[model samples]
Target: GAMEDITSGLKQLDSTYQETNQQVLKNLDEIFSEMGEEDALNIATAAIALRGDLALLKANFEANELFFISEDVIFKTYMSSPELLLTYMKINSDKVLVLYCEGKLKIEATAQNIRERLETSLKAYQSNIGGTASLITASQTLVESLKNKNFIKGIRKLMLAHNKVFLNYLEELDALERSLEQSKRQYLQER
Candidate 1:
């Protein structure tokens, strides 16, 4: 009976992992489909690479399933049940997002600061060149491209949206952990 439980637990874990893996791949496909031809190709290529990496990770874990069946592993696996792996994945995912968000915010701030300084210098150049039409025209052209600036706004919006999505996932994971911990404690007490 105990052996049966171990086999059952492994099966359940594998099933959950497979489902989540498929969902991630499907999301990548959807995003790829929504892009322009060239953008789609770029995304598709990255998705394929990511799929290969994920497959390797899956294989490694499966190859070591027996090793993970020890007492401590089994107890945690059983207690955490369906969300054990998912919670672990979410925590790591959140950590990556936190790092990405921090880096992105810093880049955005630096870009804004540089843009303001350039604008100030350009204004001074225009004042000094007052009646020089050619020089003023050249400076204006440079300033226009410098401040045309759609890329930063787009990236900022994308990062904010991505962060929001992961924040929601973190909240869900927190709830799952709390509920699971409560169940585990109650079970232990009853035992």
Candidate 2:
């Protein structure tokens, strides 16, 4: 073919995720659940950042593919009739523009969802409860392991493990929020 390899790395990264990453994440839940608040908070936020990175990477290639497909269509028309060349380019440009914005917002939405969990977790961390301290300790590597297979290479392995820690933090916060509300309600029964 024509090489067509601009955004290929993103696709490879996208494809590398899942499968063995799933099993690797299973290991991280136990890893995350046992953490103190200091490490857990640091790990959780870093994981969120990684999630956003993947989402943006995916959106980049998706929009690239869209633009490429539109060009293919326009080129074929150029060969056949040459009538709607300018008009087709205009509409095709707009088509990609719309989806590209959508992709940006889609990534934003992913970021926001991830943040909701962090926002909740922040309240947990405030009490000096279950979670991180430094920037890049041994724990950071383990958190990054969320992205990798069990026996893998580079920091690529860290992504999945990051999410598991994040997810574990989210789950812990969800329970804590519920418990606080339950007790708060019970405290002010006003009977």
Candidate 3:
């Protein structure tokens, strides 16, 4: 039953990620197309780099899932002593936190990269056109999209929602640790 639940959860996560990624990529294409060749090239290069980072992130997610599955298998084997089990649980919890924080940092960096690229492009365009009112208005629209549509925020929300499940798992593990400690104490007292 637990395995089934895990499978279902993973499937849901995968589906959500696919949908979000597609939407983000489509929006990025539109944004890039509106810029000059040099500016578009810079943005495209950054986007490619971001894609590489995302690949690593995806691997991290897969590893995170495998870690839990392996933990379950190991736990079922009953090979770990209570102390070791507690240690494993704590380490796993820390690992999940690290993964989440790293993901957030990567996303923030990517957003900053896009912002800087856009700002540079806007300045170049503005100067070349002698600050024409129409170009200024267009630049404002682009920046507003970045500020308001904020792809980073969208991804961050999704990540946080997915992480909520891991946090719950951490809570459950903590409870199990407490129960194990209580059982150990009772056993010692009965001896």
Candidate 4:
């Protein structure tokens, strides 16, 4: 049995998911304001693409105005974030919200299947990196965040971990590309 860190993998996915929608933006602003500006901006930036409709958002920044947006838009924006979706949790912190959207239709699952998938991936990743001290430290932080009493903080930590892993992956990919280019140049020169 391998000891996996599903938290890391989930966090990894969370960092890169791009959100594109309007209602989700409004809900984000509302939830963030209630959660505090730092938390709001962090959550909003982490999941949704905030730069697109700043003009429209600026006009309807109020909470009531935010709630009026279609659930379809809200769910899609929410989906763009990682599996945990901290902002969505903020709306109903006591109950987990599993938002799944198709076209304009939206649904919620109490079982939190997405979160479970994320956890499973994290565990596999942790098992893969168990030998490294740095990996252990990072993975532990992510796991701890997942289990944190403060859901917002947990989401924040998870996202931060996710961002770091994605960056590292991109860096490695870049290095590999460079290595391949170098090898190609050497081969051409020899010929």
Q: lDDT values of the candidates? A: 0.40, 0.40, 0.46, 0.35
Better of 2 and 4 by lDDT: 2
Top candidate by lDDT: 3
Tens digit per residue, CA lDDT, model 3, 1-191: 55555556556555644654464466567975535654445445444533554444444445555655664565444223345443444454345344334433433443354355335433443333221222122222577446323433443443444354445444544554455656556655675
Clashing pairs in 4: 4-123, 5-122, 5-123, 6-122, 6-123
After superposition, candidate 3 runs with Cα above 4 Å error: 1-34, 75-154
Off by over 4 Å in 4: 1-3, 6-149
How does model 2 fare in lDDT?
Answer: 0.40
Indicate which candidate wins on TM-score.
Answer: 3
Model 4 C-alpha lDDT per residue in residues 37-133, reported as the tens digit of each score: 5555444543332343322222222221222234224434643343324444445311322221221121124124334433544454444322222
Stronger candidate by TM-score (2 vs 3)? 3
Clashing pairs in 3: none
Poorest lDDT segment (10 consecutive residues) of candidate 3: 129-138
Measured with C-alpha atoms, the lDDT of residue 50 in candidate 4 is 33
Model 1 C-alpha lDDT per residue in residues 17-131, reported as the tens digit of each score: 3553464466556965543554445445434533554344334334333433442343345223424443443454445444334433433443354355335433443343222
lDDT assessment of candidate 3: 0.46
